[PDB]
Design a protein around this ligand. Structure first.
Ligand SMILES: [Mg+2]
Ligand SMILES: [Mg+2]
Ligand SMILES: [Mg+2]
Ligand SMILES: [Mg+2]
Ligand SMILES: [Mg+2]
Ligand SMILES: [Mg+2]
Ligand SMILES: [Mg+2]
Ligand SMILES: [Mg+2]
Ligand SMILES: [Mg+2]
Ligand SMILES: [Mg+2]
Ligand SMILES: [Mg+2]
Lengths: 202, 123, 199, 217, 213, 201, 204, 220, 202, 199
């Protein structure tokens, strides 16, 4: 798996591949790894499908009640906290690598990382999953402060493309999603749409 | 669970539920006992020989162990309970300790059971 | 290592056990008794692990006795065997399983003599004759060889005598004396120990 | 925690005249991966005590959560009473020991720095509950690379000034960078004095690699 | 995986004379091949006539110590008096036994005066087995210190010798010697040596120096 | 450790060495392995020191309560049976206990051997401990229910000594107790050094 | 552990113009004593003795094989082995079994064959040597023995104040070790004589 | 153990504690850890004492045989080669961690050799349990071309750091200076550890030890 | 460790970090991981120091004899073969990740990879060692066909810089070396000389 | 399990062993002999692992005999013990180690009676009396108790008689008969087996 999220002024961009394997067999080459937690909050999942699915439903339930009870749009930081609470509390029984990104009427666009241990940290952009190891150097040399919902949306497309290229545990189609006050728009990049890089020859 | 306090003290220091229990004992078939030196005896009075009855299934005399036995007077159903509880304690006094049950020990046990039931909620 | 044997006749049941309480390389007790009195016509021959034997045996014991005090009449040897089997089998998958192997010999003034064998797993079987322990391996063939559904207690004590001598011969465990007892319409009768002239 | 995940390396602490100073790089390692390069492994526990943690960052965040609530709770009473450095260090030892005794430890080694009543406080706490006080503290690799330097200095001048001390910390944070493979030359420095707790932004140290040119010779 | 124990070293010694008890321990606290601190004595005052020394896993010594302290306060509120050295020892035994299946990795030595005013020493194993002795040492240097005391304080293996009582003065030097000799062979012993002397007058402390290596 | 107890015409004899080790290190040689349960009951110490002391002390507690509640001393069988019961619950958890419970009942001299393994048996003679096999040797060759008091003392005392000889984990001083109908008496307590310059000196 | 299978203790001390070497006498297999008269110190020439502790078989074997070499050395060379050289000889014999060593840590005590020079040393089961001016220990009670030694040894000692010193170190150390003892033997070597005494000790 | 070496303006300096332990007990308060290879080459050894000895002795012996034929003086690379190729061949079973230093026709050379056989050519190195402590001293106070005395003490300061901070190190600090024309093998160089002054008396007086058998034998 | 080699027209560029650890302790922060095998042939080493050193000396010995015997400059392919032979033959007892690059009067500039298994393959550019995993995506999106001894020499500097940033097992100083007919020039990049990338902030 | 005992007197040496060849739970041989004839004044009492005993014993045997044929005169019991020790200790760290424990009893017409004990590790010790096997644990204390450096062969056969009875009492292994033999200036003399009246 390879997940990633980037923060841009009025919103966020989210990307993930669609590969979910059991061993070396792809049980789903079209998985949807970007899960809606609330109207304008999303999370990217890596790790145990059963664990990330079960945890996300739990947070969605928790958050949905919290907002109706307050009659207000929930904070992105809150959604992150609810994942962090479950992921820290049950860290010995879960295998979840999560990234929470979304828009906040109070804090705007934000991205939080909640890796294996259960820790939580806010970042300009985050990357997770097996494939993430192959795109650190890339991402470090490419990330620019002040990118646009477009530059960003393209920046993750390259990073996910590169990672999908080298990691067996990653591949398929690239799913994206941009969130900003206006709302959420999700697109997909099949075959040719996926950035390409020529395999070195003679 | 039912926690009401059933037996309580009264203005002058009485425990009516006990005094009432004692009354039920009074309305029971007389029972006497004499201590000899080679044989102790016991007899149960007013056995209301309805004849259509069946001797065995109602003898107010029972054995608890192989060295002890007892007679009672009062509410029939209660006696049963207490009888079979002492019976159990008899065999259990042999599993914890190895020696058998004493004359007094078992009696004390029964007294302790009754006393408890005059100071426990719900009973 | 503990040995138990029982032979059912047409009107009685003869049973025997060794009297050694082993520990490490030494016999710690010269006169150990593997039999337990349950009723006036019932015995429970019990062998196994250090605490499990006594604890369990006495437990089934006092519970059979309790039955006597509660109903006036005793349990039939057949009913006791299924009782003890129920408990042992119920503790098998508990926190307190009992690791014991046993024989239940009894006489019913209506059913006759009965000998029951039981696995520490609580498998229950009725049988004309049976044994427990390594000794069983060296002696069950003898019984198959000389046992007849009509053997009289004179014969039986002789068949037993044979098995017992075999252990003095092939078995590598000391085992000098063996408690012996019979059960018939008149209850549980002792018998002299079968002993062997070793220092 | 049975298996630490994202962790922080060594932590240093030395006391000086009228205060104590603590240093910790801002690295959150995940095995051999410098994964989170900008996280604070230091915390301000009320005005007279600060804390630095080595080990599992997630657990540290947890302790940071519970300790923060505790301070808040106390502040609500405004009863003129407030946890002292020794108190926080004592509680932490009870906590770490308690968890160790449930076989579910908080995977951290911590340095408690404090100042109260004109006296300097510096305390150590294991995930097993080993705790003690001393003039200088160094966890992780720091205990093999930094503590020998710190002691060396103190065995010849027990009393340092906020400046002499900060000089030593910088020197150590350099040695650590040169030899601890899981360190990062980007740390913080926390100081406590009658004035309070102060934490200093992303710092670094001058490093000298001139021996690199001594391959042949 | 995860061990809930650690060995911090440090030794503890105690002797009982007609009218005094001595409790000594080095002051080094280590782990692995390192030194946590050079100033960490294992001697602690329980009452005005009872001192305890604890060695082994420092995590447990700390917890144990705080448990003992609290329980003495409780005893005081409950019986209106302080605990006699003997009762403290009896209690410590049960406290150690409550962790019989998850032991306090600890070797304790109690040094003080009995109700009769004489000196007393009690030694314990991690799970509460204990007894009273004339002298005893526990900890790493344990097997290093003992032999010299069996000889010097117990006049063992010596023919035609004068069984003179352990003068508090001779004791105090025996203590310093075995610890100085031990500091030579046990990597755990060193730095310093604190002594606690318990008499009718109270508890007095003395700190001798040892090799810092 | 080497302990033993046998009962004859004049009651029950109980002896034991006094050595306690930690691996090969002699941690003490002043161990009182004859536990003075009550002035009417004696217990031995083999296996785990703390394990025997603690439980038997608990037994002392239980016996005292019993006495106060029945105005009668508890029978040896009963006492040993309490100890057996207390201990059986922990079978499999590592308690280490090898002991002999001795006294004088309304049945005469009493001696029971009790294990942390679950064993509990009455017998004439018993030896427990690493050096037991040795003690058995000399004791068996010399034991008679009809031994005279001063004869029984020598035997027991000898057995324990011979063991301290062969068994490396037995030694120190040799303790000896005598259990008489009224109560028990602490017969002797002699160093092994001395006992040597006598058995051959 | 292999080393403590037979138990045992050995010690060597340095006096002014004399040397001492003592050893317990117990030969046991785990808990059980088997023999009380077990030799652990062997004569390797006059004024030169070697003391072997550890596993009984290798004690005997390392000694016998060492004699083999010592004799030829003395038949080829036209002399009597010098202590520092016998030490180097044992250091070679042991290290030839570096990856399957004999389980014994030797102790050497002696006087120069052509000088006063007292000499003592001990070795690794693999032949690493150690020379000191005071004492050396080997066996299952190294710790107990160091205890005594660091508190009873004095720089210069006449044969008698050395004998009384090494005799106390042993008996007292060996009495806090369950598998060492059953009597102690001492050897005091002087340019003129060899005094051999078997001390009075516990037999438990 | 703490052993270290530094490369200064005129040559090389080697340091080393003097403690030897059998487990967590000190067996030798004064072990000699700086070994002689050639007259211009010395080696400090850490690890399995016996291994550190024999390997060091063998390379020495082989180099005396070597220069005895070439007629020239041994080079450091040669000792380094011989040592590393042997250790490598034993895949780490010969537990020898070495700090090799000497002066060539090519100059002063300082190599660090590990038991598995790899080597490091560096201006300053440390080995042993106290190596991290010592390395701290160096990393903090190291300068190229130091003067004999300016190095001769940086090394005794690093061997000191080890001595106090590592339970595996203690006792004396030995040194070795090798320059284009000198070889100062300073055995005790420092001695920051002294046995505490005996506060009592125990001298065993003749007769205190009961004897069971005596036997004398006169020599000549 | 992080090693890398690139092929450019008349020669090759070679780069490596200087970190060699034992656990988490840096035993040498100035290691020289580029070893001369012959006048114009070099190898980068990763893995067991003892193994790579021992193997390299062996190949140097083997190759030096081969060339004198032929009185000719040795082929780069030959040097690679000699490593591959030892690394395949003793694959169960070695832990060596090697890259061989150099100049050949007959084939020009070339780079060969000989990873763990003992296999050998020629490549436009190669990367090895622990840190290599963090620079695949980078290297894949940056490599350009037709680079110059300068572009290349800078390209590896960035890759090694990035990798050294993320890998604990890599760091220190960046050593380089360019080989072409003319000869071999080796340089080093200390502190500031090392490419830098701003650590993402707010 | 095999038992070996030897008592050295002032002019002779008495030795004995059991005669059981055990396997699993049964005695496979009633009359097994643990002793081997080396010389006219030497015996090697050998016990241990299934093949190692015979193989080794006979090997040391035939090699002692060979010595006789090559020099005309026999090896002194003291010289044989160091021989057998040499081999056993030399095979200890070989591919073919022998797992045997033994006693070497012999008489030298110049040195007198001698009894040697040996560890399978090849540790060699001389001794007045000694034993091997679990029996040794239950009987060595007896010997320490009644052995005197002057015990006569009438006494010795009695002391042995004691140890042997002890095993019939405490030991848990059958062990009914024991081969017995003496060695003096006139060689190796048999003796009646010490047996016990068990079936
Ligand atoms: Mg009716
Ligand atoms: Mg059934
Ligand atoms: Mg049940
Ligand atoms: Mg764990
Ligand atoms: Mg302290
Ligand atoms: Mg040190
Ligand atoms: Mg001589
Ligand atoms: Mg001893
Ligand atoms: Mg003994
Ligand atoms: Mg021999
Ligand atoms: Mg052979």
């Amino acid at each position: 798996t390879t997940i990633m999220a980037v923060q841009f002024d009025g919103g966020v961009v989210l990307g993930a591949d669609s590969r979910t394997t059991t061993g070396s067999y792809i049980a789903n080459r079209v998985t949807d790894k970007l899960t809606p937690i609330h109207d304008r909050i999303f999370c990217c999942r890596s790790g145990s499908a059963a664990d990330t699915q079960a945890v996300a439903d739990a947070v969605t339930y928790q958050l949905g009640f919290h907002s109706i009870e307050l009659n207000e749009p929930p904070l992105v930081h809150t959604a992150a906290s609810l994942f962090k609470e479950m992921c820290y509390r049950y860290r010995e029984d879960l295998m979840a690598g999560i990234i929470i990104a979304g828009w906040d009427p109070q804090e705007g666009g934000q991205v939080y990382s909640v890796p294996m241990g259960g820790m939580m940290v806010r970042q300009s952009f985050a990357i997770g999953g097996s494939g993430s190891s192959y795109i650190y150097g890339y991402v470090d040399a490419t990330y620019r402060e002040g990118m646009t919902k477009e530059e960003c949306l393209q920046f993750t497309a390259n990073a996910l493309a590169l990672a999908m290229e080298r990691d067996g545990s990653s591949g398929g189609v690239i799913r994206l999603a941009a969130i900003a006050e206006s709302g959420v728009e999700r697109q997909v990049l099949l075959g040719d749409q996926i950035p390409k890089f020529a395999v070195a020859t003679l | 669970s039912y926690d009401r306090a059933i037996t309580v003290f009264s203005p002058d220091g009485h425990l009516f539920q006990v005094e009432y229990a004692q009354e039920a004992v009074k309305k029971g078939s007389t029972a006497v006992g004499v201590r000899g030196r080679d044989i102790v005896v016991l007899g149960v009075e007013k056995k209301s020989v309805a004849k259509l009855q069946d001797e065995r299934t109602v003898r107010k005399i029972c054995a608890l162990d192989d060295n002890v036995c007892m007679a009672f007077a009062g509410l029939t159903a209660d006696a049963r309970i207490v009888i079979n509880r002492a019976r159990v304690e008899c065999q259990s006094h042999r599993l914890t300790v190895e020696d058998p049950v004493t004359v007094e020990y078992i009696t004390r046990y029964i007294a302790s059971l009754k006393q408890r039931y005059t100071q426990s909620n719900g009973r | 290592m503990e040995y138990l044997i029982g032979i059912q006749g047409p009107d009685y049941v003869l049973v025997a056990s060794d009297r050694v309480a082993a520990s490490n390389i030494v016999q710690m007790k010269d006169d150990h008794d593997k039999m337990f009195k349950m009723s006036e016509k019932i015995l429970l021959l019990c062998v196994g692990e250090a605490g499990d034997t006594v604890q369990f045996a006495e437990y089934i014991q006092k519970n059979v006795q309790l039955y006597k005090m509660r109903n006036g009449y005793e349990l039939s040897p057949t009913a006791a065997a299924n009782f003890t089997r129920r408990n042992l089998a119920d503790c098998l998958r508990s926190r307190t399983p009992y690791h014991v192997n046993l024989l239940l010999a009894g006489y019913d003034e209506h059913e006759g003599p009965a000998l029951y064998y039981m696995d520490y797993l609580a498998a229950l079987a009725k049988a004309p004759f049976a044994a427990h322990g390594y000794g069983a391996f060296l002696t069950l063939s003898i019984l198959d060889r000389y046992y007849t559904p009509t053997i009289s207690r004179e014969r039986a004590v002789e068949l037993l005598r044979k098995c017992l001598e075999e252990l003095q011969k092939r078995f590598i465990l000391n085992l000098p004396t063996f408690s012996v007892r019979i059960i018939d319409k008149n209850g549980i009768h002792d018998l002299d120990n079968i002993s062997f002239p070793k220092q | 925690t049975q298996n630490p995940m994202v962790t922080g390396t060594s932590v240093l602490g030395v006391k000086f005249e009228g205060g104590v100073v603590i240093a910790a790089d801002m690295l959150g390692s995940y095995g051999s991966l410098a994964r989170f390069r900008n996280i604070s492994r230091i915390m301000r526990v009320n005005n007279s005590t600060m804390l630095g943690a080595s080990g599992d960052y997630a657990d540290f965040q947890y302790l940071k959560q519970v300790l923060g609530q505790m301070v808040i709770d106390e502040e609500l009473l405004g009863d003129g009473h407030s946890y002292s450095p020794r108190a926080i260090h004592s509680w932490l030892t009870r906590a770490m020991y308690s968890r160790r005794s449930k076989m579910n430890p908080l995977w951290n080694t911590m340095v408690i720095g404090g100042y109260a009543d004109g006296e300097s406080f510096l305390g150590y706490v294991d995930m097993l509950g080993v705790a003690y006080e001393a003039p200088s503290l160094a966890t992780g690799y720091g205990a093999y690379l930094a503590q020998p330097l710190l002691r060396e200095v103190l065995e010849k001048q027990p009393v340092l000034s906020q400046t002499e001390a900060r000089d030593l910390v910088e020197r150590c944070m350099r040695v650590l960078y040169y030899r601890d493979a899981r360190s990062y030359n980007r740390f913080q420095t926390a100081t406590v004095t009658e004035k309070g707790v102060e934490i200093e932004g992303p710092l670094s140290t001058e490093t000298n690699w001139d021996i690199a040119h001594m391959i042949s010779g | 995986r995860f061990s809930p124990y650690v060995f911090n070293g440090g030794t503890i010694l105690a002797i009982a004379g007609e009218d005094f008890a001595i409790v000594a321990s080095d002051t080094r606290l280590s782990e692995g091949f390192s030194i946590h601190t050079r100033d960490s004595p294992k001697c602690y005052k329980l009452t005005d006539k009872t001192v305890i020394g604890c060695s082994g896993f420092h995590g447990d010594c700390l917890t144990l110590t705080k448990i003992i302290e609290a329980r003495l306060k409780m005893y005081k509120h409950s019986n209106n008096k302080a605990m006699t050295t003997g009762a403290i020892a009896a209690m410590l035994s049960t406290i150690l036994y409550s962790r019989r299946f998850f032991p306090y990795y600890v070797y304790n030595i109690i040094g003080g005066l009995d109700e009769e005013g004489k000196g007393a020493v009690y030694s314990f194993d991690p799970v509460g087995s204990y007894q009273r002795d004339s002298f005893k040492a526990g900890g790493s240097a344990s097997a290093m210190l003992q032999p010299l005391l069996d000889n010097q304080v117990g006049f063992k293996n010596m023919q035609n010798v004068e069984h003179v009582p352990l003068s508090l003065d001779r004791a105090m030097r025996l203590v310093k010697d075995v610890f100085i000799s031990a500091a030579e062979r046990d990597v755990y012993t060193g730095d310093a040596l604190r002594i606690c002397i318990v008499t009718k007058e109270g508890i007095r402390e003395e700190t001798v120096s040892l090799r810092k290596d | 450790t080497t302990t033993l107890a046998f009962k004859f015409r004049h009651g029950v004899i109980v002896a034991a060495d006094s050595r306690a080790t930690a691996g090969a290190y002699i941690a003490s040689q002043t161990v009182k392995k004859v536990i003075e349960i009550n002035p009417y009951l004696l217990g031995t110490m083999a296996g785990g020191a703390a394990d025997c002391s603690f439980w038997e002390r608990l037994l002392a507690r239980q016996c005292r309560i019993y006495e106060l509640r029945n105005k009668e001393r508890i029978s040896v069988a009963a006492a040993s049976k309490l100890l057996a019961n207390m201990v059986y619950q922990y079978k499999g958890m590592g308690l280490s206990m090898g002991t002999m419970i001795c006294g004088w009942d309304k049945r005469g001299p009493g001696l029971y051997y009790v294990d942390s393994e679950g064993n509990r048996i009455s017998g004439a003679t018993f030896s427990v401990g690493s050096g037991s096999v040795y003690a058995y040797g000399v004791m068996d060759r010399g034991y008679s229910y009809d031994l005279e008091v001063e004869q029984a003392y020598d035997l027991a005392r000898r057995a324990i000594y011979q063991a301290t000889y062969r068994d490396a984990y037995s030694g120190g001083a040799v303790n000896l107790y005598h259990v008489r109908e009224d109560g028990w008496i602490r017969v002797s307590s002699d160093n092994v050094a001395d006992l040597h310059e006598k058995y051959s000196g | 552990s292999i080393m403590s299978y037979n138990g045992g203790a050995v010690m060597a001390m340095k006096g002014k113009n004399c040397v001492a070497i003592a050893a317990d006498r117990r030969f046991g297999i785990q808990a059980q004593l088997v023999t009380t008269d077990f030799q652990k110190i062997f004569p390797m020439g006059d004024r030169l003795y070697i003391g072997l502790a550890g596993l009984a078989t290798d004690v005997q074997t390392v000694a016998q094989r060492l004699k083999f070499r010592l004799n030829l050395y003395e038949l080829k060379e036209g002399r009597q082995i010098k202590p520092y050289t016998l030490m180097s000889m044992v250091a070679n014999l042991l290290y030839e079994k570096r990856f399957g060593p004999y389980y014994t840590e030797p102790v050497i005590a002696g006087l120069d064959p052509k000088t006063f020079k007292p000499f003592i040393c001990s070795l690794d089961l693999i032949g690493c040597p150690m020379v000191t001016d005071d004492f050396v220990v080997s066996g299952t009670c190294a710790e107990q023995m160091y205890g005594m030694c660091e508190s009873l040894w004095e720089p210069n000692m006449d044969p008698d104040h050395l004998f009384e010193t090494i005799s106390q170190a042993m008996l007292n150390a060996v009495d806090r070790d369950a598998v060492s003892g059953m009597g102690v033997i001492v050897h005091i070597i002087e340019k003129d004589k060899i005094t051999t005494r078997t001390l009075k000790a516990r037999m438990d | 153990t703490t052993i270290a070496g530094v490369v200064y303006k005129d040559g090389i300096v080697l340091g080393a504690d003097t403690r030897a332990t059998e487990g967590m007990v000190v067996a030798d308060k004064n072990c000699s850890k700086i070994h002689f290879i050639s007259p211009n080459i010395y080696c400090c050894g850490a690890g399995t004492a016996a291994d550190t000895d024999m390997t060091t002795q063998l390379i020495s012996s082989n180099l005396e045989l070597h220069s005895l034929s070439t007629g020239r003086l041994p080079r450091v690379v040669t000792a380094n080669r011989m040592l590393k190729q042997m250790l490598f061949r034993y895949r780490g079973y010969i537990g020898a961690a070495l700090v090799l230093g000497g002066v060539d026709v090519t100059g002063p050379h300082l190599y660090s050799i590990y038991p598995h056989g790899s080597t490091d050519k560096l201006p300053y190195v440390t080995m042993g349990s106290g190596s991290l402590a010592a390395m701290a001293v160096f990393e903090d106070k190291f300068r190229p071309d130091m003067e004999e005395e300016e190095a001769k003490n940086l090394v005794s300061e690093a061997i000191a750091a080890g001595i106090f901070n590592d339970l595996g190190s203690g006792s004396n600090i030995d040194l070795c200076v090798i320059s284009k024309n000198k070889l100062d093998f300073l055995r005790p160089y420092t001695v920051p550890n002294k046995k505490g002054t005996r506060l009592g008396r125990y001298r065993c007086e003749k007769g205190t030890t009961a004897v069971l058998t005596e036997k004398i034998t006169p020599l000549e």
